Design a protein around this ligand. Sequence first.
Ligand code: 3HA
Ligand code: 3HA
Ligand code: FE2
Ligand code: FE2
Ligand code: FE2
Ligand code: FE2
Lengths: 174, 174
Amino acid sequence: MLTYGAPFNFPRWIDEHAHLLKPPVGNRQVWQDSDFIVTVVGGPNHRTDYHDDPLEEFFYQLRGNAYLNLWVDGRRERADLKEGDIFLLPPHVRHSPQRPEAGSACLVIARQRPAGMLDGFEWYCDACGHLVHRVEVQLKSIVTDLPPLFESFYASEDKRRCPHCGQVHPGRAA
Amino acid sequence: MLTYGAPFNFPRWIDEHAHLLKPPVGNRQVWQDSDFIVTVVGGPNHRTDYHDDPLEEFFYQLRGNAYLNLWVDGRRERADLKEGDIFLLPPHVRHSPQRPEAGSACLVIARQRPAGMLDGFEWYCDACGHLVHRVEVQLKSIVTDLPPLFESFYASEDKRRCPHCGQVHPGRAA
Ligand SMILES: Nc1c(O)cccc1C(=O)O
Ligand SMILES: Nc1c(O)cccc1C(=O)O
Ligand SMILES: [Fe+2]
Ligand SMILES: [Fe+2]
Ligand SMILES: [Fe+2]
Ligand SMILES: [Fe+2]
């Protein structure tokens, strides 16, 4: 049967769950236990991490504007997500979503990762740009696994200390 | 780098490629050679087949309305796709997309199938409902593998002959 239920109005669903799109991530999954992970992300969010997703991610900015901070070579870049843009992110491109606008909404689609395909979360030095800290995880929820991770980074000066220049990353106000 | 290029305006892309959304399928792939198969489908299309997709499919009806004829038990059903609806179709649910409206557009997202994960295309008897004909394929393009398949069904009375009641399926005007 229709395991994921019947079709429904998306604009109206987003209006109804707007109150639930909370920071740091601003996440919300539309269907549970499905192979496609379909989420709506709103603003304002708070992200200092770069995600290393080992699969592709699809974006469609439905309301408001946002941008992804990226590493493209070793260079800091930004891909803008103006209202109405779509974007397909290749695997492993480090990205840090910035969602400043209240009432913002972006459709974000990813797939369940196979066992032993791990996500990376990375922070980089503000001063020298060297990698400061990386955690790899077998992700089981993009909604409710993210903020505990950021938490233990923020709460610890040794994790935030650049191993190249010794600058201590600002953590939860970067 | 950004293999699939940078973000771009989706409404405008659809307007620009509207002339290309041709029947029977009405298909068009946004990015090539990617793991997510992201297509826009428009109308009017012409579909008599039921697709047995071994992975999930995501739908977001962006412009116009459409419906999927389904088999849910062994029962013929219809899930309507009114403008603005989203829908996640489970694996293997037989579906026949009907897109009657000109200037219609639906975002449809699927994944590349692994080797040896085959798609099924099926036709059913109008009179008795028995399965008339099934082809399994290792799909390599959802745009440009579909219509040749339908073609050899339509062009052949033995393929269209119900093995239960001997009724010959109407083929290319069903
Ligand atoms: N891209 C994202 C991710 O991988 C996890 C959570 C949120 C987002 C986003 O785009 O905001
Ligand atoms: N669902 C579809 C598919 O699997 C192939 C081609 C077209 C569609 C559609 O929704 O029209
Ligand atoms: Fe991400
Ligand atoms: Fe540093
Ligand atoms: Fe299909
Ligand atoms: Fe029959």
